[model samples]
Structure formats: structure tokens, C-alpha cells
Target chain A: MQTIKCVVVGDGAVGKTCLLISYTTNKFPSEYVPTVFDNYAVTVMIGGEPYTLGLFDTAGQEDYDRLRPLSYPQTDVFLVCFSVVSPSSFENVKEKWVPEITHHCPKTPFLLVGTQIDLRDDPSTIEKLAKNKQKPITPETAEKLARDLKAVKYVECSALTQKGLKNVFDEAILAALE
Target chain B: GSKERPEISLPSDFEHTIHVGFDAVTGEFTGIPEQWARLLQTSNIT
Candidate 1:
């Protein structure tokens, strides 16, 4: 019946803002605004009662490096995002996000989220990774990293297209309640 | 690709669509809005 504070953290412009904007507004926004919302939430009903997921969006601009972990306290679960086009996003997951959260909330579970999928299958991304055998950090590989990171689960989305966006939040909520 | 459904059951109201739009600035969810129920009617058409 209370709110589950789900914090989202990732590198800048990696669609973290887009995910929340599209999920709440139901339409893709073309602007690049940070922390566009203050206390945006999603509703979940279990049996006859309503539960809330209070989403906290963070700035990944690195200057906020000292400020981001303050919200880490009492976080029920987290949605850690990376873009498929940029493998470096995944690298930061291991090098930064995972390392930082583990320090603050070792018990808090998080979902590995891949974002920006409208061009998920762009020629350069799909064609360059495996040498025409072709590869882009595919879902299976993403899952592999999630397993390697010991994440609760791996989910992905296109905030622009709203594809798989629900499940990203769904998994976030489920991880908190589970 | 297999169906990526959440393993647990969700309310029929939220199975396909999760009704959002909580104005954090305003902070008043009076109750479940009626439009969400109507959205479910079409969602179940699948």
C-alpha cells in the first residue's frame, strides 16, 4: 500500500529520461530535459489494494556523482540502464553503477535495462559487432552481463516506441516486492 | 522471441497497460480513474 522507491541511474542521454517521460506521458518527447519530473509514479494493484511505484530519476552527468547515492538509502529496487548502440554503457554498468550501488545498498535488487531501441537494428549497430556474422550487445549477451553482475533480471525498452517499457517497470516493481 | 510476460499475475487492469500519469508535483491520486478501466476493455481485445 506504500510507495516503492525505484531509482533509475545510468550514463547521460542513455534514454533514462525518455523511459520515464514516455511511460508517464504515453508519448515520446523530443526534448532532452533532465529530471523532468519530481515524483512521478506508476500504479499497481494486488488483489483489491493499490500499490505505488515512486520513480526517482537521477542525473548521470557525473558532476552529480557525489549527489546520486544520497537517494540510494531505502531504495526498494533500481532500474540500471544502458543503451545497446553503445557498449560503453554496459561497461559503465560494471565499472560504475554496479560498484556504486553495491557500496550503499548491497541487499537492494536491480534490473539491468537496455534502452533506445528505435534504431536498435540500425545497419551500423547490427552489421559491425560480429564482423557480418553481426553482433550488437544482443539480448542474450545483455542477460549474460546481468547474470555476471548478479542482477535480479535483465529488461529493455524503447521509450520512443513504448516497446517493452511496461515490463521494465513491471520487473522493477516485482523485484522490490519479491 | 518468446512472450516477455511478467511471471507473476498482474491485475486485469494492468496486464498489458500500466496506468500512470501521477503528477508528482501535484501529488493527488484521487482514485483509479475511469479511463483506465476503459483502456482495459480494448487491451483485452487481444
Candidate 2:
């Protein structure tokens, strides 16, 4: 079986680990560990062939910025994640995450992932963003950014509810194969 | 829309590890971290 290396990157506390834990376990983690780095693997079938899907998680804090690229060397694809409710995290997709990955893997494909959509329409979530005169990013807006950034695709999911979670990895597998 | 769940399996002897250090300023590959020598534990695969 072949192995597909997929790395996830984004701003701190943007639920990068939560997204992976939920997708692989079907259970949302109740706590955050301020990840330095972690990984998960699963066997996936693409066109009837078994392939190992290795999911690499990295710390999004500035402290790990120097060490993060160590995992970039052989990556087949990347998942550039941000919380849908975090406007700044979304901004970093272009400002930081994308640039960092492109710097190391210039030709690698990546997906623009908007996470925590379960909170996108929550009153409390919206209320918090409203206080800052910001709003949750809409799918159309993210898709536009994905295109502008030259990402393979834009995908969104709510790890808390598992909404659109499967599609995220499916798109990732397709992107890796491409 | 009809994609089935992907099934993942791991072999008993399947173990792959990566350990490398780098010069932060120049992005140069330094030697491996000395402490990482003990991290060759089994992976959490599903």
C-alpha cells in the first residue's frame, strides 16, 4: 500500500487538532493540548487500492513556526485550516499558513479548510464576532479565497457536529491523488 | 455523496519515524534531536 502524507496547518487555537480527532474518532475532543505535533493514520481505498493516509498535526503557535516545516519535506497534500468564527485565522490562511507551506513545498497541493462551522450560526458565536464588527465567513467567500490562493478546493466542517467532515477528507484524498 | 467509510489497518511491525533538527535562522538541517531517540513507540492508527 502507498502512503499519502497530509499535513494540517493554521493559527493557534483554530481547532486543527479537534478537526483531526473528530474525523478519525467520530468524537470531539473536550480539551486542547496546545499541540507541539501529533499524527494519525488510517487506511483508505482510492479506486479500489488501499493507501495509508497519514495525517500530521502541527502546532500553529509562533513558537513552533521554526520547527513546523520539518514535516513539510515529503507531504503529498496539506489542509490549511481555520475556524469559521475566527476572522483572523482565516486571514492567516493567506498571510502565514499558505506562504509558509508554499515556501517549503512550492508545488504541493492544499485545501482551504474552514473549521468549526457548528459555531458559525450560533447566537453566542455570532454575538462575540458582532462585538468586533466581524462575521463568520461564508462558504462563497472562502471558496473565492481558495481559488485566489490556488488551493485545490475549499472545504468546511463542524467537528462538533460532524457536519461535512467526511467530505473534507474525501476531497483531501482526491487532492493527494491529483 | 455515497462514499463509504474508509477502513484503515496497521501491521504489527509497521513503524516509521522521522527525527531531524534544523538551524532556525538559515533553515539548515542540523542533526537529530538527542531526546527523540526514545520516541519509537507504536503509532495510533485506525
Candidate 3:
């Protein structure tokens, strides 16, 4: 048997928890709860054998900055997540999340995860970002950032619509094996 | 999906029972079967 530790990190309220809950429980979170070192595990079959994919959900708030690293020690792979609809969260992929992980697990591989793609084109979401002279992050821009950060790859999904959702973890499992 | 790892599957008879207080740190779901955990530890799954 195997245990693949896939930890996710990003700004708060960027859908990190939703991503895991949706993938594991097949239900999107109805309420927002500020996560603090939460994790979920499921048995996944790769080539006809069962394996555990331990998905760790982390808090991105500064308050937990010191405590978050506790989960980094045994991580097999990391999911550096951000909301595609949030320019600031996207910026933190380079400004914060990647540096934080690489500092702790310098040799560990991570994939950039852009979440909330369902909101990227939503009228209300667009209007909200436009007020701040910002718009949703494009896949090309995110992919470019992933390359710049030397991430294994870039993946995006919408927990709300369950679109491209499974691929995120599927890539993560592959990265962990790599 | 990436070409390297094309397909992933869950066991046909797999059952997940979410247990509370099993994992003290995160207070999240734990108690995944040992068979599955051990299988993932192998190098070939990559």
C-alpha cells in the first residue's frame, strides 16, 4: 500500500477547502470555514491497485504562518493554489506560497492550482474585479507563472461546476509519484 | 490529464468510513484502509 501526501496551500477564501471537499465528498462546501491544517484521505486505484491519496488542506492566513509548516515535513507533493478570479491570490503563487514550500521542502515538487474558474467569467465576479482594475487570471498567464516558478505544471478547476476538478488531484498524484 | 499518469481508479469494493478524533492534528477524516495505504507506499505506483 502507498500514501501520497498532497498538501494544498494558498490565500484564504481562495477555494482550497472546496476543492478537496468536492473531490473527496463529491459535494461543494456550502459555507466558508477558515481551515487550519485540515486533511482528507481516500483510496485511489492506479493500475489496478489501491493507494491512499492524503490530501492536506492548509490555511493561508498570516496568523497560521508559523504553524502551517508542520504539515510540510512528510509531504509527497504540494498544490500551490489560487483563485483565477483573484489577481492578488494569483500573485501570491510567486510572492508567498511557492517560496514557503520550497524553503521547507526544497526538493519537493508542486503544481500550481488555479481555482474558481467558474467565477472567472461570471458577470458579478468580473464586475467586482473590474472595480479594482483587475480581472480574472488567464490560463496562459498562470501557466507562464508556473514555468517561472519551476512548478511541475499548472492546473485549473471549478469546484462549483465540478469541471476539471478531478484532474487537479490526478496530476497531483502523478507528481507525488514522480 | 498528463501523459505520464493516464488513469487512476478506486477499488471496486472500496468503502470509506469517516471517523472523528482519529487524526488529532487536523481533526479531519482519517481511518483509510491499511491495504490502500500500503499500496501507495510502493515505488511502482509512480
Candidate 4:
């Protein structure tokens, strides 16, 4: 059995703890301040073999610039978290978060998660859904990201409802296996 | 949407919820405080 380290990175208050609590403990706080740099570990069996998923939740605010370097090494997967309510956070994931992680953890698999699906008035959800008439992300954009980042897959999940969580983890695990 | 409830199962060894709080700074878990641990000996979880 081998262990895999997965890091959830995004700007502060983007529902990182909410996603962790819901997925791990099945408990959700009505609200949370993004956790200051913290680590959590959970064990799971993949392909009938045991493995550990080491999770690190870092403060999303940019003033903690020095901490970014501490996150990249030994990361097997990147769970880039964004909140449906904040477009700025989404932009941060694109402009700042992904680039830094990619610079260090080049081969690591990445999965995109837009959190806070239960909030009912999130901006990202509205933006992503508004172009309903068109296929999501357009094929060219999807392929380009995949080729550039070497990511196996991407998904949107709501931690509150546990919707798309298994899919998220399953896709990540499959990437680890590959 | 389908009206039928999806299949779910409860494992036989399942236990009652354990209230846990952790020190965010030290990362030490305070799981099932001593009093609660003692109660688990007599409580019917299933």
C-alpha cells in the first residue's frame, strides 16, 4: 500500500473547511473562516490496497505568500477549490493558485471544485450555468487545459449536498493510479 | 428526478456519533472526551 498527498488550495473563505468537514466528518458549519494552514489525514482502500490521503488546507489570503512554497512538494493531487459565490476567488485560482502549484508540482493531477453549492446565490454557479445552451467549457478549452496541465479530469462539486464528491475523489484516485 | 429513495446500507459495526473537537494550532484531536467514552460502554449504539 502506498500513500498519496492531496492538497486543497484556493483563496481564503472559499469553503475549504466546508468541503473537508462534509467529505470527512459529514459535518458542516453554517459558516467558516478559511482555516489557517492545517493538515488532515484519512485512510482509504484503492484497488483493495490501503492508502492515505494527506490533506492540507491553507489560508486563501495572499499576504501569506511565504507559505505557498511549503505546499508544492510531495503533493500527488491538487484539489483547486473555488467558491460559487466569489468570482474573484475563481480568478485567483486561475491567475495565482494554479500557476504557483503547477510551477512546483508539475506532474500532479488537478481537479477543480467550486464549493458552497447550497448557498443558493453563488456567482460562479450563475456564470457557469448561464451558457446552458453551449457545451460546458467548449472542447478546445478543455483539451488545451488537459494538455497544458496534464490533469486527468475536472469537476464541480457541492460539499453541502455531497453531490459530485465521489466523482471528484474517484477521478482523482484514477489519476493517481494512472 | 426519480421519486424512489436510493439504496443505502448501515454497517453492522456502525457506532454512534462521537463529538470531536481539535486544537486548530496543535492539530491534536479531543475525540470522545473521557466522560463520553465511558458512556459508550453502556449505550446501545445499534
Candidate 5:
């Protein structure tokens, strides 16, 4: 059997854990406790052979900056994630996430992920943002940043609806293996 | 024979578990079995 180490990083509330939990458990976690987000793995039957996708989650808050990269040494691929509705998280993709991972592993393949798309078109979400003169991040903008950063590509998904959820990890496996 | 590795079969419980996972750190899946944690990681060590 072969294995690919896929570590996920992003802003703290950008649904990094939700993305993994939903993919693994096939349901949205109602109670998302940061402390309970155990590192997990899933096995894939790729081309009649078995390979493991190890999912590692890192705390994105400044508190863990010094401790986060302990998981970086062997990472085959990384999911640099952000919430579609979170402007700050998206901003940090350039300022924080991309720089951090590239700093640690310059050549590791990484995907620029936009998480929580379920709220992208919701009236409530839109109205809330309308106050600050903001809009949910469109795929176009994110993909542009993806190109600017030289990411493998930009991918988005909703953990709650599982829409495009599987693609994120599948693409990760491809990047890791490729 | 030293370089030859035995075939790996799925654990009885998850025979149909379509998605499989591995731990380079532990070199085994949960309930999937473990023989070469060191080997898995040290293949080499990642």
C-alpha cells in the first residue's frame, strides 16, 4: 500500500475540520469542538490498489503559530482553505496561509480551497455582508489568487450539503500523487 | 526474501470500506492492522 500525507491549513474558523469531518463521516458535525478534532485518515481504492490519505488539521490562530509546523515535515500535499463568506480568511490565504506552507515546504502541491459555499447565496448571509459593503468571495476572485500564488488550482465546497465536498480531497490525492 | 513483502488483506470488519487510510506515523490504519509502522514511515519516513 502507498500513502499520501495531506495536511490542511487555514484561518481558525474557516471550516478546515468541517471539511475533513464531513468527508470522513458523511455528515456535517453539529457540535464542532476544536479540541475534539482528532487527526484522521481514509483509505482509497485507487486503480485496484490501496492508498491512505492522512488528514492532518492545524490550529490557524496565532496561538499555535510556533507549534503548527510540527506536522509539516512529510506533507505530500496541503489544502490551504478559506470560507467563502469570510473575507479575512480569504485575505490571509495570501498573507498567512500560502507564505507559511511555502516557507515550510516550497515544492509541496497545495490547493487553494474555498469552504462553506452553502451560504454564498443565502439571503441572510448576503444581507449581513451588504452592511459592510462586502460580498461572498466569488470563484473568479479566488481562482485569480490561486493563479497569483501558483497553487495547483482553486477548489470550493460546502461541508454541510456535501456539494463538491469529495472533489476537494480527490483533487488533493491527485496533487499528492502527481 | 527479505525485500519481499506479504500481500495485505483488509480487516474482516471493513472489507467493504471503500475508502482506506494509512498512517505514516503509525504505519497502519485503525483496525486495518499494523506490521511496519517504522517501515511505512521510513519508506523513508513519510
Candidate 6:
């Protein structure tokens, strides 16, 4: 048995907790409570391997900025979340957090998450900003990023509809085991 | 071996019953760490 620690990173209100609830409890909350800087641990058995998933959901806003340093104590994986609906949030990862994260956890694996597929119904909206938006990176785009970062994988998940959600953790566990 | 590590099963069970207590220096609730108290961070946001 081994412990694989995982942290979920995302801008505020991008549905990190929703995905956690889906992964941990198999339930979705209609409302949300903002996550502060801290670790939440879960025990999961994957393919006969035991892992301890530590979830780090930091405050996406600048006010809680000081809390970022507190999350790096023993991180193994990072699940970075950004809303496909809001391109600005996506940009923040590149401009605000990516460098900071890589600086701290240089060797840790990461998953770039594009959430909110339920909003995919808006083609006009999706197309209007697809060029610059993190607009749910296509599987091809995700694969490219994964290769570039030497990350385990990239996932487009929708906890609201449970779309493309099943294999997310499976991928993480495999990376840890290997 | 070295006392088989505890296993946490999912879809039917949670990992453990975890609680957080305050670490005065950091001004946050966290699990005890070797050098200092490490804050307990949760991944899921509401």
C-alpha cells in the first residue's frame, strides 16, 4: 500500500469542490462554499494500490494569496481547474498560477481541467472565444499540453452532468502507481 | 511486512474520519506535521 497525494487547484468558483464531491461522495451540491487554503485527505484503493489523495483547493481570489505557500508541504498531483465558460479564469492559470505552481511542485504531475460542459449548448458563445478561451481544450489540445508539461493527463470534466468524469481518477492512480 | 498500510475503499466507503485543529502559528486548522503544523486543505469547493 502506498499513499499518493493529489491536490485540486483552480480559480475560485470553477467547480473544484463539485468535482471533489462527485469523486469522494458521488453527490453534487447545487450551491457552493468557497475553499480556503488547506488539505483534505481521502483514501482510495485503485487497482489493488492504496493511495491517499490530498486535495488542495486554494482560494482563487487575491485576498487569500498568502495561503498558496501553505499547500506545498507534501503534494504529489495537482488537478488545475478553470471554467470553460470564463476565459479569464483560464488566463489566470497561465498568468497567475502556473509559474507559481511549477515553481513549488516542479516534479509533481498535473491535470489541466476545463470544467462546465453543461454550458456546451452555447455554440455561439463557445465559438466566439474559442481562439483565446480555454474553452474546454479538445482531446488533441489536452494531449499536447500533457506531453509538453510531462503531466499525467489533461481532462475536460463536468461534475454537474458527470460528463467525462469517470476516468479522471483512474488516470491519476495509474500515474502514481507507476 | 511493516504492518500493511491502511487501505481506503471508495464508492462504498470514505478514506477516514479526519478532523482539523488550530495551529496557532499559521492561524489555520491543520494536521500535526514534523517541523510545524501543516494546514489541512480540501480540494472540493462548494
Best by DockQ: 6
Error of 3 at B37 (Å): 22
Model 5 DockQ class: incorrect
Q: Which ranges in model 5 have alpha carbons more than 4 Å from their true place?
A: A1-3, A13-76, A97-101, A104-107, A133-136, B1-46
Task: Tell me the lDDT of candidate 2.
Answer: 0.50
Assess candidate 3 and give its lDDT: 0.50
Q: Which TM-score values does chain B get in all models? A: 0.18, 0.19, 0.19, 0.16, 0.12, 0.17
- lDDT, candidate 5, A1-178, per-residue tens: 2456764454334324434555454343343322422345666443345555564433333233332345334466656555566545567567755666564655456766664567675767766655654756677887776677666777776555655756776766666655
Task: Locate the minimum summed-lDDT window of 10 residues in model 6 chain A.
Answer: A27-36
The DockQ value obtained for model 2 is: 0.04
lDDT of 5 by residue, B1-46 (tens): 0111334543322222112122121111122111111122322333
List, residue by residue over A1-178, the lDDT tens digit for candidate 4.
Answer: 2355665443333323335455544444433323344455655433333444565543324333333334233466655544444333443445544576554654567766544455434454556555542223332344455566566665656555655566666677656534
* Deviation (Å) of A171 in candidate 6: 1.1
Q: Please state the error at residue B34 of candidate 6 in Å.
A: 28
State each model's C-alpha RMSD to the native. Answer: 13.7, 11.5, 11.2, 14.3, 11.7, 10.2
Tens digits of per-residue lDDT for model 1 on A87-135?
A: 3445556765556655365445676766566676677565554552333
Q: Cα deviation of B9 in candidate 6 (Å)?
A: 13
lDDT tens digits, residues B1-24, model 1? 112245355573332212222323
TM-score, each model?
0.52, 0.53, 0.53, 0.45, 0.52, 0.52
Each prediction's number of clashing residue pairs = 1, 1, 11, 2, 8, 9
TM-score of chain A of each: 0.61, 0.61, 0.60, 0.51, 0.61, 0.58
- Candidate 3 structure, TM-score to reference: 0.53
Better of 4 and 5 by lDDT: 5
**Candidate 3 segments whose C-alpha is farther than 4 A from its true place:** A1-4, A13-74, A97-101, A104-107, B1-18, B21-46
Considering summed lDDT, which 10 consecutive residues are worst modelled in model 5 chain A? A28-37
Give every prediction's interface RMSD.
16.0, 13.5, 12.7, 16.0, 14.4, 12.4
lDDT tens digits, residue span A23-127, model 2: 444343333322334445666444454556575433333344433445223466655555667545566566754566554654456766655666666777777
